[PDB]
Amino acid sequence: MKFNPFVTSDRSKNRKRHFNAPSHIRRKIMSSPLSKELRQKYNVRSMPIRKDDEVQVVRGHYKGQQIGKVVQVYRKKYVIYIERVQREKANGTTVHVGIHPSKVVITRLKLDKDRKKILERKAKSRQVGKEKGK
Amino acid sequence: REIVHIQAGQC
Amino acid sequence: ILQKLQELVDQLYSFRDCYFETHSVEDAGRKQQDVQKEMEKTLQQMEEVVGSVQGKAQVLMLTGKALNAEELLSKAVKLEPELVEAWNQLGEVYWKKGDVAAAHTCFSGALTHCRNKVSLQNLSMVLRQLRTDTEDEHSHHVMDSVRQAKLAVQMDVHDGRSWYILGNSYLSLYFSTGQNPKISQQALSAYAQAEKVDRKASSNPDLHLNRATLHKYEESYGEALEGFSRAAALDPAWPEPRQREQQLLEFLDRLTSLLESKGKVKTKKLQSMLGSLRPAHLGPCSDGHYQSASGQKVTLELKPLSTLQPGVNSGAVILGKVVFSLTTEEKVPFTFGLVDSDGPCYAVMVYNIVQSWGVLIGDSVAIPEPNLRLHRIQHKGKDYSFSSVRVETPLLLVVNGKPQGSSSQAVATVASRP
């Protein structure tokens, strides 16, 4: 139960700040879980998704054992485009079917100078909580 | 000493 | 004095060859550091022996061969331009430095002075690592490399190194000239000739790595894994044969798990995809007007996957549903599993693809003229046993009753780099 008097539980307010969020807030909103192989290696449960990440769908029509590179992270409709998830139109032109980042799990991260620092920050703040519990 | 890789084509 | 310089440079080359014997991976993290300390000590006492006999370009090519720097032997071979072995060592110096054009310049100068085995071998190398702007220039450089390696063999039919540059050269012809299997046969024949004639060709980790990469491309996984294991035994500190071995092993583990489990597809969805299979998904293979590779119009029969024979099943066409797809990091073979009934799953290997091409789970895939292969792989206590249908290009695929355009096909390119 939330006890902070400066955080709101209003449904309309939460829906407003979610749907009118700025782009750097939408980056944190559009996060994806890591696979259980990367979870035990990085001690990180979830990461914000990037353009060059290999990722695997777990829900919907396109769920399976197939792994695709993200084509793009189109944060305006809160959705990503992945490499082989696509749909033929009437004329025959293929368009990318959008998948939400919460219904897709990362199998391979794109390691930058900043995303190593993000994993290390998450790992240190998880081990501080483990030490606080223990 | 030289190393050989074989990647897929781009076009 | 000059004989003392000969002894000093062959002792330094013996140190560079014996570093992995005397120090190994416990100290091969400090490989470049200890080697440059040894070359600095050799350079110092080298210089005090040079100081009596500074005038001789043989003395200075020995100094540059010990440094195999650039300015020293450049002044040396400006003093004596005829000096072919100095040109060879200088091209190897810029090859280590990354100056491929200057290496080619020095080896071309060496062959204009005097034809010999070292310059033929090293030019046949460096013409492949030369950066090109056009594909015809690349193919001309590859064919020139084949020519220089052939003349290297014709100077020495006992040189397992020269057969190794032939193996690389016919591998590059195989990956540049339309993929004729005779050329890959000749490449592996050159590797076998090297291993037959030269005992020091057995101790080269690069021959095993290149032969194992060719075997990986032609799906000889057991001999491939033997090749990467032997290369990893020959140079344990250089972790790329280990990396290739572990990625091929994890590919085989994931692939055999997915063929055994049919890609974690629930059986109701599997029966739905099997019941959604229609003869209209054959596309142009259903009207009897299929044109084969020989140009004949052959009526195809729809044959089930379980009754097929190894090799090319002539006149047969197969139709299945994708239950899983998989690709590697190296992403030349696109693999996907097909089922046509409630029997076993069959892997399909698709080569010569564009990076964005693939199939989805649930797509009806029809393959005319299937080319079976039974894979029985044993390596370090790990066993694999499956069947794979190899297709060379995606133009022979009929997916959802529709053939693909030429935009789905791109020939896999070869890369030779320092």
- Give C240-280 as a DSSP string: HHHHHHHHHHHHHHHHHHHHHHGGG--HHHHHHHHHT--GG
- Assess contact for A85 and A97: CB atoms under 8 A: yes
Q: Is A65 in contact with C263 (Cβ distance < 8 A)?
A: yes
**Cα A63 to Cα A56: distance, rounded to the nearest angstrom:** 8
The pair of three-digit structure tokens given for residue A44, joined into one six-digit string: 């990180």
Coil, strand, or helix at residue C129?
Answer: helix
- Determine whether the interchain pair A67/C263 forms a contact, defined as Cβ–Cβ distance below 8 Å: no
Q: For strands C316-326 and C301-302, give the pairing.
A: parallel
CB-based contact, C265 to chain A, within 8 Å: yes
- Cα-based distances in Å from C203 to A27, B5, C195, C209: 53, 21, 9, 12
The experimental method, as deposited, was cryo-EM
Identity at C33, one-letter amino acid code? Q
Contacts of B1 in chain C (CB under 8 A): 206
Nearest CA to B6 out of C236, C347, C407, C168 is that of C168
| DSSP label of C177 | T
Sorted by sequence, the CB contacts under 8 Å of residue C141 that are 6+ apart come out as: C127, C128, C130, C132
Let me know the angle formed at the C-alpha of C179 by C121 and C223, rounded to the nearest 5 degrees: 75
Copy the structure tokens of residue A57: 């769908």
For residue C258, give the chain A residue with the closest CA. A65
CA distance C349 to C221: 13
Structure's resolution in angstroms: 2.8
Distances (CA, A) of C371 to A13, C259, C356: 62, 18, 24
Subunit contact C360:A62, Cβ cutoff 8 A: yes
Q: How far apart are CA C64 and CA C416, in angstroms?
A: 26
What is the rounded distance in angstroms from the CA atom of residue C86 to the CA atom of residue C69? 12
> Tokens 């085989």 identify what position?
C252
Chain C partners within 8 Å of A67 (Cβ): 326-327
Q: Which residues of C touch B4 (CB under 8 A)?
A: 168, 171, 209-210, 213, 414-416
* C143 touches A: beta carbon within 8 Å: no
Neighbours of chain A (3+ CB pairs under 8 A): C
Burial class (CB in 10 A: 0-12, 13-18, 19+), C180: exposed
Residue C116, exposed/middle/buried by CB under 10 A (0-12, 13-18, 19+)? Answer: middle
CA distance C40 to A75: 57
Q: Write down the H helix ranges in C23-134.
A: 31-50, 57-67, 70-79, 84-97, 100-113, 117-129
Distance of residue B7 Cα from the nearest chain C Cα, in angstroms: 5
Write the residues followed by a gap in chain C (C–N more than 2.5 A). 68
CB contact under 8 A, C354 and B7: no
Give C359: exposed, middle or buried? Use CB within 10 Å, 0-12, 13-18, 19+. buried
> Which is nearest to C224 in space by CA: C186, C183, C252?
C252
Phi, psi of C385 (to 5 degrees): -150, 105
Q: How many residues can be counted in chain B? A: 11
Extract the tokens encoding C413.
């390119």
> Are the CB atoms for C152 and C121 separated by under 8 Å?
yes
For residue C197, give Cα distances in angstroms to A21, A36, A131, C149. Answer: 71, 50, 64, 16
Q: What is d(CA C3, CA C16) in angstroms, rounded to the nearest whole number?
A: 20
Asked if A108 and A32 count as a contact pair (C-beta separation under 8 A), the reply is: no
User: Hey, what amino acid is at C111?
Assistant: L
Structure tokens at C256: 């055999």
**Distance from C-alpha of A49 to C-alpha of A60, rounded to nearest angstrom:** 19
Asked if the Cβ–Cβ distance from C327 to A65 is below 8 Å, we say no
Look up tokens 């790329």; give the residue.
Answer: C240
**Short-list A48, A67, A40, CA closest to A117:** A48
For chain C, the straight-line distance linking the first and the last C-alpha, in angstroms and rounded, comes to 35
C-alpha B6/C-alpha C216 separation (Å) is 11
Return the residue matching tokens 């259980």. A36
Nearest one of C256, C184, C176, C253 to C216, comparing CA atoms? C184
The Cα–Cα gap between C339 and C323 comes to 7
* C358 three-class SS: coil
Cβ neighbours around C238 below 10 Å, total: 20
Query: CB-based contact (8 Å) between C326 and chain A?
Result: yes
**Side-by-side strand order, sheet with A79-88:** A94-99, A79-88, A67-74, A54-57, A104-108
Whether residue C417 and residue B2 make contact (CB cut-off 8 A), yes or no, is yes
Cα–Cα distance for residue pair A98/A100, rounded to 1 Å:
7
Strand partners, A34: A106
Q: Please classify residue C366 by burial: count the beta carbons closer than 10 Å to its beta carbon, then call 0-12 exposed, 13-18 middle and 19+ buried.
A: buried
B7 is in an annotated binding site: no
Q: CA-CA distances (angstroms) from residue C331 to C223, C269, C411?
A: 20, 28, 12
Q: Calculate the CA C362 to chain-centre distance.
A: 34
Q: Does A83 touch chain C (CB under 8 A)?
A: yes
Strands C382-391 and C346-350, by their bridges, are parallel
Whether C77 contacts C87, CB under 8 Å: yes
Amino acid in the structure at residue A1: M
Residue of A nearest to C326 (CA): A66
Question: Virtual CA dihedral for C360, C366, C372, C377, nearest 10 degrees?
Answer: 10
Find, among A65, A12, A73, the residue nearest to C254 by Cα: A65
Tokens of A73: 């992270």
**How far is residue C49's CA from residue C41's CA, in Å, rounded to a whole number?**
13
Pick from C410, C411, C417: CB nearest B3 = C417
User: How far is A55 from A53, CA to CA, in rounded Å?
Assistant: 6
Kindly report the number of other CB atoms within 10 A of residue C207's CB atom. 26
Q: State the Cα–Cα distance between residues C333 and C338, nearest whole angstrom.
A: 15
Tokens 């450049």: give the residue. C74
- Give the number of C-alpha atoms closer than 13 A to the C-alpha of residue C159, restricted to the C-beta side: 18
| Amino acid at site C264 | K
CA distances from C146 to C150, C189, C250 (A): 6, 15, 35
Burial of C44 (0-12, 13-18, 19+ CB in 10 A): exposed
- Pick the closest to residue A59 from A100, A107, A109, A108 (CA basis): A100
Beta bridge partners of C291: C297
3-state SS, residue C324: strand
Burial (Cβ within 10 Å: 0-12, 13-18, ≥19) of residue C139 = middle
**B3 interaction partners in chain C (CB closer than 8 Å):** 206, 209, 240, 416-418
How many CA atoms lie within 13 Å of A31's alpha carbon, on the beta-carbon side? 12
Chain C residues inside the 8 Å CB shell of A105: none
CB pairs A-C closer than 8 Å: 33
| Closest by CA position to C331, among listed C410, C226, C224, C221 | C410
Q: How many CA atoms lie within 13 A of C234 on its CB side?
A: 19
